[PDB]
Amino acid sequence: FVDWCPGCGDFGILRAEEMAIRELGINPKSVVIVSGIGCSGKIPHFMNLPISGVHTLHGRSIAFATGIKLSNPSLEVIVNVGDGDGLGIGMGHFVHLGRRNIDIAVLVHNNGVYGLQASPTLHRGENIMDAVNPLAVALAAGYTFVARGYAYDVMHLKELIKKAILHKGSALVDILQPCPTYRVYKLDNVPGWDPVVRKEEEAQKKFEQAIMKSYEWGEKIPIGIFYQNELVPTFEDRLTSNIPNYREYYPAKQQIEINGISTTKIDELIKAKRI
Amino acid sequence: FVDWCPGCGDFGILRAEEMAIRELGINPKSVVIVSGIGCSGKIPHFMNLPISGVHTLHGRSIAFATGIKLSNPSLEVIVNVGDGDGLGIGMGHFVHLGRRNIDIAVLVHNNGVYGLQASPTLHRGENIMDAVNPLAVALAAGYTFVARGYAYDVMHLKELIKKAILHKGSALVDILQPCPTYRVYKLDNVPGWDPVVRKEEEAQKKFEQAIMKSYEWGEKIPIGIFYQNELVPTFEDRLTSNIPNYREYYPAKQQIEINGISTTKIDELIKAKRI
Amino acid sequence: TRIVWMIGGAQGLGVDTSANIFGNAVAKAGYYLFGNREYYSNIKGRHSYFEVVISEKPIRSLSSYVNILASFDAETVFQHFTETKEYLIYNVEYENTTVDLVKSMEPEMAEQVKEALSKERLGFTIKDVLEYLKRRGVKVIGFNYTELIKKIADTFKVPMSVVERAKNMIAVGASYGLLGLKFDYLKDAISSTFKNELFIKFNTMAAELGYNSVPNVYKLQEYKIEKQRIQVDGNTISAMGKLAGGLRFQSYYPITPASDESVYIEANQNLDMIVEGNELRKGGVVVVQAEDELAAINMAVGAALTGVRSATATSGPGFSLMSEGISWAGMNEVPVVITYYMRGAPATGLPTRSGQADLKFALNVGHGEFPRIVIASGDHVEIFWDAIWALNLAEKYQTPVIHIIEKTLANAYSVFEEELITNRPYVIERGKIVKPTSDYFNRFEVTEDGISPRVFLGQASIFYTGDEHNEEGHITENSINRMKMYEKRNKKLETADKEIPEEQRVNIVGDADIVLLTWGSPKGAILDAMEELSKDGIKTMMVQVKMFNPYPKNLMKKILSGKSKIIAVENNYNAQGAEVLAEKTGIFATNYILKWTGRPITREEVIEGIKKILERDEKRVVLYGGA
Amino acid sequence: TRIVWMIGGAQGLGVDTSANIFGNAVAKAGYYLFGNREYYSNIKGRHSYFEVVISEKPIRSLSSYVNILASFDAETVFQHFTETKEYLIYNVEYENTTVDLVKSMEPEMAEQVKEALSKERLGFTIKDVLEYLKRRGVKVIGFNYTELIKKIADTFKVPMSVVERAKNMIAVGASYGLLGLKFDYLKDAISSTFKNELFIKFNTMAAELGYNSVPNVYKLQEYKIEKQRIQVDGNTISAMGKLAGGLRFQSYYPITPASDESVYIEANQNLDMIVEGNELRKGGVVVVQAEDELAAINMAVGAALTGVRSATATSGPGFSLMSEGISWAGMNEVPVVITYYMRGAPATGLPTRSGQADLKFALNVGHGEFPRIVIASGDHVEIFWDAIWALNLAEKYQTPVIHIIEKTLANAYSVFEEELITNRPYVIERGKIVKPTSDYFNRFEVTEDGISPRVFLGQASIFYTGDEHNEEGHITENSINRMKMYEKRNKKLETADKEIPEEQRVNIVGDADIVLLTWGSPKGAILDAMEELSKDGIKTMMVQVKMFNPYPKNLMKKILSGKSKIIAVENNYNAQGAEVLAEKTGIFATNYILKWTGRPITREEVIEGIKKILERDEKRVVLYGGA
Ligand SMILES: Cc1ncc(C[n+]2csc(CCOP(=O)(O)OP(=O)(O)O)c2C)c(N)n1
Ligand SMILES: Cc1ncc(C[n+]2csc(CCOP(=O)(O)OP(=O)(O)O)c2C)c(N)n1
Ligand code: SF4
Ligand code: SF4
Ligand SMILES: [Mg+2]
Ligand SMILES: [Mg+2]
């Protein structure tokens, strides 16, 4: 039973995520959606493709996703987290993924509350605490793709989510999404707007632009991509410098046993300790 | 025994913190230094005034400090944290203090390592992970005073630390500090430089400036104050709106018992549940 | 008189308030109540239900059967028809609705509904359920609720959609009608709950319609309430006792069973206090919503260093996160209470259901050996006094105290005599607090009893650290200091064990050769079960542990002595309470009555459990009733 | 032959490598070694020491006494003179240094040094210590180290400050000289450890100076090494067994006792593998330095969902943080090994010292009931095989396994026969893994034995959740599903308990009426102590538990039967291993030998403990030797 309230917002994200996976032609079997605790958390349980779901602890999705991805980089790993979930209980993990730049897309369901009390993205007043700009945190954390979407413009979202999965690195999509129980615009429509970094010397300029666009909010509320830089080695690129065949023979793929006997040789390890 | 390596850096911070407390004429009895795990962590144990020390869990100083301060706001509460400590294990607590704007000063000992492996403020290469700009994180988190100091210019540090304690709100001083076992400049010397917000309309401009100065690093490395805004109500200001006499009769001051009998009346609480 | 009513409906149809209105009316008539709320981890649409047990005498437990099931949808009928014994109130619009059309119902429940109907060759419609009920002497009372909502809308000249929620009060009106109590008490409980004049009048009409559509079947008479009576839940009563105990700092992270307690404290945070020279003064409790549980525990522990009585409240996932901070409080001999709302586990578990499966974890939380004082409340009145006791324990022994309250008690409510929580004085015992004589104070003096004199931050120079430390609080690795300090902290638990009477740590009721060994929420169901069993010549006694550490080991040896049956009754799979008895004394339970579904043990589950054990020495009776 | 050497010095004087050089030379001569490193939580300046026990036979324990104490500073003399039995090598420059001038020494140790000297009316200088030693037949051998460092600098025409560290090798040279073994082995162990030609030659000269300045007193002869021998620490051998067990993902957060293991894995992460058709292939172990322990546990658990054999390593504070993630692994039946380097606790505790004080926490970690398989290695060879066993246990029972290794074994090293870790085959048992027949797979099938067939992410559509769930992995609150699923996970522990021989879960040595009941690191000291006691006509046996869950309860009943003394020997205050025996069987230990200072139990502590108990029924012998 799809048990969210009528009105929600979460229906639009589900719909747009589903469409992103389909139109990419990614084999769904190889898609793991890793989601947090909250009403946002239920999501993969309600999809209509043979994707896999990992419904994790509150704020801990990114850490699970990390293990999954690094162990089997041929899986396509997507994190869906509520705003109480990431940003609240998971802020540290949220920042650190940014420094690693692992090939993962993270989707934050910004409803403004703990649906299932005030969340980290509720403005002061209206609540004793201030709100945080997820996009500015993500930028300073080192995320190599930062975007804002909006849950009602489904067709735009679908395409954000697509560019976010194709991004070679860590991607955030902060998604605006009303909670019924507890004017916008698009950077695709701006003639200047090139958020893509295409050579290294260009990087600071684009970063500085993203971070200032990300603060704009005087009901001239942008959406789309704020920053994108594929020149940053991924975490998987750095693993490959230490483990030459990581891509061809990653941990999930290796044969560790034949007829119940270890295939792993430690003779040289032991030899190095001889008297 | 003051057991840090000869060469350290931590000696300069100790010296400058000590001088800040002295020259303020704060009664030392009312000063609690709350410090994390690591060599940085030992610090209050080695001071020469009757200050109190709380040597806490790794990354958890800010949360302890919060309890201490809010329970007795007449204490002067200072957090000293290593870079592995805050920023690594404590990143979430680090961001959330920014949203609350509690009257606390936080001092980060940026040595670049886990002294007592690579830390969160070690640059990529030279280490599989990227570094984070503590100052940019602090700005996006909502810290109302953000500064960089340097551990060898002791006299400048001393005064940063002073302005950081006097700041009515949450203050960060990121402190640069070499670790022997594992050109700069000053914004006081810049003629433009006014980081103080003095009316509300001024706030975005100063914020935007701080955040871009905070990225400047092409061996033209600034130090001093990047941002300061005393117009943001403190957490203690917001408590006072709900608890009118919080300042005069805060939790640590209240008489809860006379001759072992509760002074607390719950009659009205119970009356409201009558049949 | 013991009459069990249930109402049910989709979450967010405000049926839970329907149930509080029904209870409020009955209570005003002089009846005691015990009430429970069952809900899914879900905001709207899933099936919730509300059992209310009615009696002229104080009532302590839920039952496996319902006398009167009130309903206005198809799903409530399907979820509770096998438990329904005397009357169904139902909506004739759903008579041809089949199980498969109830989309909000878990497929596991639909399968079980079909199984129960198939078992006696019935199909899967509401009509089939009505025959199932008629085979058992149940009288079914059908309403065209649509037509009644019409008639109300007609009267208030509104469209049906404004008054649709009044289905609830038609059901409540008719239920209350069966009882035979006078309408005024239901009308007053309506007026008193809703604010808006207009909600009041159409809901009143709806109750009236229900009430006048049924006969007076139970013929219940009014009773006079001699002593003031109160209606309270577990959360609220935990808050009441802490505030009474002098709590002035609480940090929490939202989590279903425990958020309520901290929100209640915060809504009432400005307390009247009668202070020196008998002056009224106001004092504020600081409540902080932490960003996670690690912060919650650590804010509380820091607060306490200032001399404030501090606490946090949480549930299993959150408790696990607090382990490190509890270990720090242990090492630094910090008074702090952790109210542990024990819910269905492991991991996220059953966020809205209950369990007793984290007792041993609680007794061993975090690394190192240090005193963890652990109590567990067995019913609502205990929660109040246990909350004050916890706070005093924490300051007397300068160490964390864990106060277990099962979810089941937090969301249950009961009506009882106010004097149970006002008659005895509210004693505050602050332990070994002293005035420092000079600027520098040794916080960790080695004394014979373990307990070091304590002063607060601000009063003199003191040091705390997570590392092993000497008497001044400075980092010390020295072997002999280590031997001494580590023993000193653990010796406090020996002091506690000498100073606290073992009789305060258990409730013993009866004297017999069959022992019902328990702790926590099953207390109530067992005491009710003992009376029924007594009347069929089965003598039993209850031994209910309140304080698991220090454990009442000599008293338990003396009591469980030559007993032929020791039946552990607990809401877990391993009988963790019996495991601690066995570790402390070598006495093993002979049999077990066990429930791990997340729903409370009922009176009748215990009666039938005990008979199954006496009449065939069944080793483990496993319970599973409740939707 | 059992000869105990110790060297000491300020941390960062590279004295620890001095000690590995001394050991390396002795070992090359044919002697077995057991070695230990003791250090402060401190990078430079504090006193570290290094005990090396030398024997022609394999050696298993440390001693409370030192035959030869090597020193070049004042502090090492002050810290170890009461333990020194045959020879002191010391620096005559410090003869008039008084205790009070040693600034780096904890004041608690200075007080104790003065106490021990005052006790027989001596003052507080090194000279006074020399008289203290002379009163006990100790021969003191003094060096003007300054004058020797001079002579070396003269030779290599450098200033004294380049060669100052060669004080270390003068001490090692003289120590080794006392033994009487030939210089070549010390010269080779020098050449082999340092890289730079120049370091080699001045350090060699320094050893030569020491060696030629002393007589051959022990007259030790060379022995032939028949079978290949290895020298390894606990960390490293844990890594070796995991890698051998097929580990390919480890996440960790730095923490002293366990960082070494993950750094060793990462330095050797590209492994040779002999794969299908006998092809050499390389395979890489992914090692991730997590930002905290919550991430470390959760990265590991996620990794395992892909079919990788994953693990993490940590110590007490970190373990506490992992509690929640372990509970999630339990609920979702995730194979994962947590290597638990148990150190001095609570809180930060003694970061560089050891303890056995977290066993019960480990057995009850996190909320809910689910199987937590717990083993604890008793010595270095066990660590290897226990590491492989842990990984197989995790996949056979699909649940977290905690592998306890005390800090004491991690930082101790020993020399033993390579074949102890190569002779038996390295068996990998992957449990109930299957090929999914279609697109959607039920990960949580209810079977009789508890264990659901498992497939990996990628192979078919599967679901995991922290909530209670049905067989497909979807959130389910249904009571009957709950009853079934929750039992099913716990039934695995019953299956484990049937399938694992109880004999594999304990080591029993001897047959006698006096039982030494233990687990973990005291194994070695007890086995050595038993032999010495045997030779004075005291018959004892050791019962050493390896697997605490499932606990070998029938075998322990059978064995501990009619025993008159059961002496629990553990490194904690509450005898937690004896507490679990008592919970599982009702058998109580009669006496205790206990140590909670953080330093290993020695052979002689056990001998004297056992005699104190036999000759006056002392209930608890509390130990405290070691600086
Ligand atoms: C460690 C832990 N702490 C707390 C909880 C309780 N909890 C569950 S859902 C919830 C609301 C979460 O809010 P959010 O992440 O904003 O998700 P939403 O429901 O708004 O999608 C809370 C507080 C838990 N399951 N685990
Ligand atoms: C919860 C927890 N995890 C890990 C540790 C182990 N630990 C102690 S000090 C240390 C180094 C800390 O580095 P940093 O915070 O950078 O401090 P520094 O020594 O560089 O001042 C580590 C990893 C601990 N005590 N507690
Ligand atoms: S609560 Fe708010 S968020 Fe959770 S479901 Fe109902 S609407 Fe969507
Ligand atoms: S290690 Fe690095 S930081 Fe810790 S003390 Fe020695 S120098 Fe200062
Ligand atoms: Mg949310
Ligand atoms: Mg640091």
List the helices and strands and how they pair.
The complex is a heterotetramer, with two copies of chain A (275 residues) and two copies of chain C (627 residues).
Chain A: H1 10-24, E1 31-35, E2 52-55, H2 61-71, E3 76-82, H3 84-89, H4 91-100, E4 104-110, H5 134-141, E5 145-150, H6 154-166, E6 170-176, E7 184-186, E8 196-197, H7 203-213, E9 221-229, H8 235-242, E10 257-258, E11 261-262, E12 264-265, H9 267-271
Parallel strand pairs in A: 1-2, 1-3, 3-4, 4-6, 5-6, 7-9, 8-9
Antiparallel strand pairs in A: 5-9, 10-11
Helix pairs in contact in A: 1-6, 4-5
Chain C: E1 3-10, H1 15-28, E2 32-38, E3 47-55, E4 66-70, H2 75-80, E5 84-91, H3 107-118, H4 126-134, E6 139-143, H5 145-155, H6 160-163, H7 167-179, H8 183-193, H9 197-212, E7 229-233, H10 234-244, E8 247-252, H11 256-267, E9 270-275, E10 279-284, E11 286-289, H12 293-304, E12 309-314, H13 316-331, E13 336-344, E14 350-354, H14 359-363, E15 373-376, H15 380-396, E16 400-406, H16 407-411, E17 413-417, E18 463-465, H17 479-499, E19 506-509, E20 514-519, H18 522-534, E21 541-545, E22 547-549, H19 553-560, E23 565-570, H20 576-585, E24 591-595, H21 603-616, E25 620-623
Helix pairs in contact in C: 1-7, 1-8, 5-9, 7-9, 8-9, 10-11, 10-15, 12-13, 18-21
Bound molecules: thiamine diphosphate (2 copies), iron/sulfur cluster (SF4) (2 copies) and magnesium ion (2 copies).
What this model shows, in words?
With 275 residues, chain A is α/β, with parallel strands linked by helices. In chain A, 32% of the residues lie in helices and 20% in strands. Chain A has one domain (8-263). Chain A has helices at 10-24, 61-71, 84-89, 91-100, 134-141, 154-166, 203-213, 235-242, 267-271; strands at residues 31-35, 52-55, 76-82, 104-110, 145-150, 170-176, 184-186, 196-197, 221-229, 257-258, 261-262, 264-265. Chain A starts with 9 loop residues before the first helix and ends with a helix. In chain C, helix 5 (145-155) crosses helix 9, helix 8 runs antiparallel to helix 9 (197-212) and helix 18 packs across helix 21 (603-616). Chain C is globular. Chain C is built from 21 helices and 25 strands. Helices cover 38% and strands 22% of the residues of chain C. In chain C, helix 21 (603-616) links the parallel strand 24 (591-595) and strand 25. At the B-C interface, strand 2, helix 2, helix 4, strand 10 and strand 11 of B face helix 1, strand 7, helix 10, strand 8 and strand 9 of C. Strand 2 of chain A pairs parallel with strand 18 (463-465) of chain D. The complex binds thiamine diphosphate (TPP) (2 copies), iron/sulfur cluster (SF4) (2 copies) and magnesium ion (2 copies). Chains C, D: It comes from Sulfurisphaera tokodaii (strain DSM 16993 / JCM 10545 / NBRC 100140 / 7).
